[PDB]
Design a protein around this ligand. Structure first.
Ligand SMILES: C=CC(=O)N1CCC[C@@H](n2nc(-c3cccc(C(=O)Nc4cccc(C(C)(C)C)c4)c3)c3c(N)ncnc32)C1
Length: 265
């Protein structure tokens, strides 16, 4: 089928950087385009579960979502082929350009991510690991969401267990760090942390807290402070994303209207 890419259809030009459990290269895909190619090391992911879901994932086509183009599975290590995002991760894009962006621009970056997340929410697809590190920057400074649902395939328990050393506790809602209870409402909590990373120009949330300290702090009502560039209205929306009860958090469809209201007026 079309989703399978033959090794003869790909060339590797240069490294982009280290991804999770594998290297990412810049390359070309025959008769198509420039692409980013991930080589995944053996044992890191459930390749069979991923191959079963690949065609399904490839139908989640939205301009604010980084596209999966196909899979090169002929030989180990398998390759995953994606839409190439010229300006890389949003985390480094902000950190290297501190002082450049106006709040209107930072809000527009949050609006791009929110639009991609409202599409996934309508499709009943949970991201599970939304953070600035997997939002990528493309043409005309567009931000696109990447790696939605990919943690379903990770095999290292240090990453998947809510108590594992590499679990993204900093972006987790309490029902996720307590019970791994994923939903679009737990993605909303993560989106609030993403808004904080954006308005802080790429600062690390809860920088001097261990993961166990973040659990206790969040459970006892602590919340991230307001970034200097965030207005009080922006910070109010961040706090709505961090409500303890998932039912009290806004849906992405509601956030998209609230943030656009601020952006368009
Ligand atoms: C800060 C520096 C930065 O910019 N980085 C870090 C190094 C790699 C860069 N990178 N990563 C991707 C990219 C985009 C989407 C998915 C993946 C992926 O491999 N999923 C992925 C593939 C297979 C398995 C898994 C598991 C989670 C299951 C382990 C994940 C990779 C990418 C792209 N398309 N265009 C440009 N650069 C890109 C991002």
């Amino acid at each position: 089928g079309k989703w399978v890419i033959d090794p003869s259809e790909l060339t590797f030009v240069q490294e982009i950087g280290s991804g999770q459990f594998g290297l990412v290269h810049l390359g070309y895909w025959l008769n198509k385009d420039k692409v980013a190619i991930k080589t995944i090391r053996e044992g890191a992911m459930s390749e069979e579960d991923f191959i079963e879901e690949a065609e399904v994932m490839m139908k989640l086509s939205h301009p604010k979502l980084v596209q999966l183009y196909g899979v090169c599975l002929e030989q180990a290590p398998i390759c995953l082929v994606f839409e190439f995002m010229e300006h890389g991760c949003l985390s480094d894009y902000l950190r290297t350009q501190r002082g450049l962006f106006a709040a209107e621009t930072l809000l527009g970056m949050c609006l791009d991510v929110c639009e991609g997340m409202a599409y996934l929410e309508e499709a009943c697809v949970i991201h599970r690991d939304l953070a600035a590190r997997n939002c990528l920057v493309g043409e005309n400074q567009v931000i696109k969401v990447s790696d939605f649902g990919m943690t379903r395939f990770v095999l290292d328990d240090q990453y998947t267990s809510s108590t594992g050393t590499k679990f993204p506790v900093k972006w987790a809602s309490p029902e996720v760090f307590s019970f791994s209870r994923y939903s679009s409402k737990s993605d909303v909590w993560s989106f609030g942390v993403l808004m904080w990373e954006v308005f802080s120009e790429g600062k690390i949330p809860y920088e001097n807290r261990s993961n166990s300290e973040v659990v206790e702090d969040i459970s006892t009502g602590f919340r991230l402070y307001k970034p200097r560039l965030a207005s009080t209205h922006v910070y109010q929306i961040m706090n709505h994303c961090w409500r303890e009860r998932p039912e009290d958090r806004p849906a992405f469809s509601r956030l998209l209207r609230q943030l656009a209201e601020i952006a368009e007026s």
